[PDB]
Amino acid sequence: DIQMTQSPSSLSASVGDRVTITCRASQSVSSAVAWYQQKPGKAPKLLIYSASSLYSGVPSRFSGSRSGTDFTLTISSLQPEDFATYYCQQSSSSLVTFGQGTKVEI
Amino acid sequence: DIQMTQSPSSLSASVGDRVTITCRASQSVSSAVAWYQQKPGKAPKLLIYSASSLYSGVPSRFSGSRSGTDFTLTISSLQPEDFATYYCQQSSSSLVTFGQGTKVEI
Amino acid sequence: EVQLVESGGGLVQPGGSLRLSCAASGFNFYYSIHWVRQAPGKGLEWVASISPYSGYTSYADSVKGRFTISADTSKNTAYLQMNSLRAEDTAVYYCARKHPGSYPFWGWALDYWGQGTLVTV
Amino acid sequence: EVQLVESGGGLVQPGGSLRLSCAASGFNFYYSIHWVRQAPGKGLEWVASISPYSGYTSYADSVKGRFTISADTSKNTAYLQMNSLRAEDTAVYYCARKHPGSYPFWGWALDYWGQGTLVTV
Amino acid sequence: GTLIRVTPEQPTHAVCVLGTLTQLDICSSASFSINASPGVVVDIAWPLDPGVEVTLTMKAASGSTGDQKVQISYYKTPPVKALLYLTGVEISLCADITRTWGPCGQGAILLVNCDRDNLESSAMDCEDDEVLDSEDLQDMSLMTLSTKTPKDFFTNHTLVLHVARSEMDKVRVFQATRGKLSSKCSVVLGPKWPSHYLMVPGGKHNMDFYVEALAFPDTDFPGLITLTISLLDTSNLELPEAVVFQDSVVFRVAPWIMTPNTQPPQEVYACNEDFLKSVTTLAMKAKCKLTICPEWMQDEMEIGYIQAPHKTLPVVFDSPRRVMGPDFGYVTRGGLDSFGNLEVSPPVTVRGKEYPLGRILFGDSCYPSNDSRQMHQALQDFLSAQQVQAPVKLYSDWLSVGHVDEFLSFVPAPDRKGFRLLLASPRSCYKLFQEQQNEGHGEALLIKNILSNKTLREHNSFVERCIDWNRELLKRELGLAESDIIDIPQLFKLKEFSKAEAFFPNMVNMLVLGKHLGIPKPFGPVINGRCCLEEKVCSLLEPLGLQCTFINDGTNVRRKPFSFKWWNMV
Amino acid sequence: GTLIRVTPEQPTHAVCVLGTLTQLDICSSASFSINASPGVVVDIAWPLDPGVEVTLTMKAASGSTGDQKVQISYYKTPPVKALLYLTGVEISLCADITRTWGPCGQGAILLVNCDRDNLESSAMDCEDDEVLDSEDLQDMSLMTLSTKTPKDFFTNHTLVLHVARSEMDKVRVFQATRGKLSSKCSVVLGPKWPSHYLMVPGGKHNMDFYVEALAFPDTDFPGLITLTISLLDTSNLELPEAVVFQDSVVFRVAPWIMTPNTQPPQEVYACNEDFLKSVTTLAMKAKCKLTICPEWMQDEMEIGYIQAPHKTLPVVFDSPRRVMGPDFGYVTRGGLDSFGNLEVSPPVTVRGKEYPLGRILFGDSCYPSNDSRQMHQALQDFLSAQQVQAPVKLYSDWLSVGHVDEFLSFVPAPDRKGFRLLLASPRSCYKLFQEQQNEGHGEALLIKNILSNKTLREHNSFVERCIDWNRELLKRELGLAESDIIDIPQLFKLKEFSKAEAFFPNMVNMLVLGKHLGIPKPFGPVINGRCCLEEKVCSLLEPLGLQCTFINDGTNVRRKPFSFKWWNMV
Ligand SMILES: [Ca+2]
Ligand SMILES: [Ca+2]
Ligand SMILES: [Ca+2]
Ligand SMILES: [Ca+2]
Ligand SMILES: [Ca+2]
Ligand SMILES: [Ca+2]
């Protein structure tokens, strides 16, 4: 199996702060990862569909990139509506796995 | 040289008679002969341009054919205007030769 | 009009079975369909996938032999048949279409996530 | 309007020369041109030929070295230059175009025979 | 054509070709006025605004370079002027354009030199790389380069003739010289010469060229060939040549055209002495030439022609399984491939669309089964390349042979469309026999014995639909009505592999010479003295004025080309 | 469709397809009247005269065979009658016809399955002989066979789907089944299967097919593919099958389309970090996506697209000297062959003829000299096979490289045609330098030293005409006016073999993203502080609203496809 490792488990930041979430792959996956944002009680939403490929309709505040075996999600400045639990997906095989989920608190 | 031999040298026939003129080739010429009709004091006229190939405009009274090494000109029935001296041509090489000419008298 | 809706949940006794469905609206159902469940207090766990017009399917190791995924291409509806349900299978079950990657690295996402169903064993 | 006309004849003293010509009317002069002479009391004797646009020429053995055939394609006119004329060359000289054969045996005739010229040496 | 600019820095010179509008830029260069010489016409299409465009034309070609000028006066400041000197030349590449498509279209015509005018040659005149016989220039298209330039012109310029390389294997061009003892043609453009320089003298000169096509329109050749003359400026001998003016003409290569049997015949070829006796009599009655072929032709051959305003000639088309002469062309290409499976309909008009040359017919299968036969695509593509006769496809694989002409033929008619379509009809033959039995003649021999045969009826039912299938196709493709179709008695049987075969001698595929029909004789001269098949065929056709004779049956027919000019159709 | 006859001898039966006019022959068979059943509509287009044509139609399809009949009454003699029994069926081969040419034309569209939707595949989806991913059905065209027949129909009949063998290598067809655990597609027609039988059940049934094109329009393929369904009558099992009804649809394969630089960009690909920094800033200012390509693409590639009413996708076109993915196509074909010598003009209207997709431009020689270079014909033929962008030919062999885009480019404009043509102009550069010398700046360095150079002036004179030659060609081919053309300073020199080379960094061949121009920086930042070349370029373009930045110069751009639908042009 291909285990996703996310870090940190939670963030603490105020409105206007710049924050990043990182995830480590267990294998040399060919940039094939995606990032999801889950609002409380709602289905997950898609933000980034391949490393650096921003999903259409997502505000420019969201971006991310590969860095060797690690992947990063960046929010240039947290807005009041940007606080949610984020997930990282590695759809690299017939067996899909997700990370643990990282919650961003105010 | 390719000698043409015509026979007879002259004919004697009345109006309405059927007459033939024959010519003998000196070599196996590939049906390549023609027949000319010369009116007194006039340039020769063309009647048949290859063995059996009647020239356009000539009345159907005139015909001819090959018979091995000999060629024949036939007039189905002499008309008052058909009495003239006839020539046979063998254009089989770069050197053209004609026969002696056969005169048809009334 | 373009959305996925799911149904078939409820309360089942341990050892029983449930038949979940996901119906498409405004969508020709040509894309691969995925099921992903989230138990309370846990993150997302992908369950299974189907390619409708080729019958290729895939299951997570935790549900192999217990779950069957199927679909009716004439009704634009996918089905997940869950047998021998255990308490550990309690979760909210979501359905989503595949979404393709792009140049240079073609890895793929999930999109138009539905409302999900509540499965209690 | 479609006819051949010839000129250049007359009386010449033995050993002299004459330049005969044949001009085309209503004809583009594309076809090979032939000269044929008939001495009084004799039959037809072909003299010479020219293909204007290729300059191939042919002479009868009796006139080789004495006659030259030539043509001006800009004037649709052929020329026969007769030098060192002898008494034996007295004849009426005619000009005609070639006429093609036809299937199956392609042997060729002479057509549109002109009026001819009188050559007296 | 070209662009002329002016400046006070240096005097400027230009060459203008009569009939071509030359652009002059006086703006964006140091109010102004223009005063052209009396030999130059200038107009405007002044504040030096680039939107002011000046166009130069010249009245006549000059005999000297720099004879005309245009005075440019600019205008506070000292006077500013520019001097433009113009040279007038006339260059025109002439071809027979008046004779695209349509009765009002324009374009040159080029024929394929596929005949053999050289009697000592063993190959086509297009294959020789030369002109040896002046007669061959009658077939070739004439092109003339006409120039009128200053006496010293072409000191700084040169003319080059060229064609596209993709067309270099489709066209050959010859140039005609001058002299007294000869007027030789010479090779200009060809498989090794896509371009050639012309030594054109100054002043007035006309140079003549003879063009031949080397191939028919086909998959690799749409049928258009473009010849271009280019005027190059070489005034500076240290630099590469520059181009200042080009002109070109486009030739359209004539299609090979098939002749229907409704065109008056010209010559029968007889490649069975009693048969020949009847053909001799038939040809005589029809006023056709007959050529017996004693000893160089095949029954597999088809005879078409090439049409042009200057020269028309017949062309033999020969089987995929060489016979050629002066003005007698020969073309080749590449079960159902034998040209017995080729036919051409009379001229028709189909729902407003005219087919003045008719349409090419051939038989094929209904669907590509593993066993079904097909006519080779190379032939279908070749025939389709000639749009003038829009080929159509019929169903013939049900026959043991497959030749489409086994069940249909055309004859002339004195009214309506001028022709009738004759189809094999087992229905009419059945009725013919059944009517005779009903009248008390069922004891006649070749009838009630075969009428009772179940196998024959079932075989003819299968065929009946196989033929009616084409009846509908022809009504749709040719626009025919039932009143234009005649049912000719003919029964069929199935043999090995269940393919259809004629029960009795075929009543179509006859020799048609004008109004005289050489119908094969049926073997039924036992029924009431006069064969019922012969009387039925005659009765159907006699009201048309056609003369029917029955021959107790290796030949071909050449027929008159169409009076319609193919290049006048859309 | 079919022909029906009647007779008292035996009852007659027929099958009629709704919507097809069926011919009924009551004449020439034993005054008469017709009384059709309430379910049948009969009219006439009676004295048994063959000119009286009876046409049958039926109101609805039947659930049983022989449910309807037409009573034929003939009439001195005993009563004579015939019984005709009709079966009503509905057969229709459906395809997307409404979406020939023109905004009011009709015809189906078929796309080439040239993308790679299977992420584990190393080949195109058209190359696999299979459907493995349901997403691939989004690209394929849908065809439906809809039949409504008697419950016992197809006991005596069968349906066969087929295409012409000449098209069997251009199209593949799949049939969609049903089930619960799967809905498999299955191979019907392909390189080994020109025809296939359909097990269609009786009553009402709809069968669905997915069609893919296997190749682009090219020399060997005009772009049309015809699919035919054939209804065969097999009622008599001892005889070969007969055909009674056929129907077909025609697909048109979409052309590959080149996108001009005037279309809004979508993605830059960066295959020189400071250069990338400027491109990142330029892309940012232009709101374009930038993709850096770290580690699978080349600068030699060109990006086009395929348009359809159902699916639009980009397609890479790759050099003659494989990169593909989901909805990201890839096509290949086969000095001047590098696609740097390809360009496409903005949409133009030329003397009333509209080119809504512009025209494809490429450079070539003026005449085929022994040394002149040419662009391979295979590419010219491929590009010309797509009539929608009518390629044109420009003169570029005078350059050392030959790429046409070295001297011309297009930019957007806010008025008139919406764009401007930018040409290299040694005239403007000369004036720019000469004006600066005239104002007292001749001592500036990169100017009077190069202005005095005779060789430079002579080399630029040669080139000057080489470029104006194309100026005239473009005005004629694109319909441009001088007010639509901008002169961009640029001097040239001749090197080895006397080919033109840029004197200073090229001022065209820039990176254009919307209104933001990534102009190469000239190396003249010494003249009066602000390079005179930069100020001249800016001054010319600033009135247009375009934002000019100079980059001190391995990339590509994908751009938005046209909103115009290519199938609506003539
Ligand atoms: Ca030749
Ligand atoms: Ca010839
Ligand atoms: Ca000829
Ligand atoms: Ca496939
Ligand atoms: Ca695909
Ligand atoms: Ca796709």
Can you walk through the features of this model?
The complex is a heterohexamer, with two copies of chain A (106 residues), two copies of chain C (121 residues) and two copies of chain E (570 residues). Chain A is mainly beta and 106 residues long. Chain A is built from no helices and eleven strands. The N and C termini of chain A lie far apart (34 Å). Chain C is mostly beta strands. Chain C has a single domain (3-120), classed as Immunoglobulin-like, CATH 2.60.40. Helices cover 0% and strands 48% of the residues of chain C. Chain C has strands at residues 3-7, 10-11, 18-25, 33-38, 45-50, 57-59, 67-72, 77-82, 91-99, 109-111, 117-120. In chain C, a hairpin with a 6-residue loop joins strand 4 and strand 5 (45-50). Chain E is 13% helix and 35% strand. In chain E, strands 2, 4, 7, 8, 10, 12, 13 and 15 form an eight-stranded mixed beta sheet that branches. In chain E, strands 9-17-16-11-14 form a five-stranded mixed beta sheet, with no helix packed on it. Chain E has a four-stranded mixed beta sheet with strand order 1-3-6-5, with no helix packed on it. Chain E folds into three domains: 3-90, Immunoglobulin-like (Sandwich), CATH 2.60.40.1860; 95-253, Immunoglobulin-like, CATH 2.60.40.1700; 257-568, L-arginine/glycine Amidinotransferase, Chain A (5-stranded Propeller). Chains E and F meet through strand 11, strand 16, strand 17 and helix 5 of E and strand 11, strand 16, strand 17 and helix 5 of F. The structure holds calcium ion (6 copies). One calcium ion binds at residues 125, 128, 130-131, 136 of chain E.
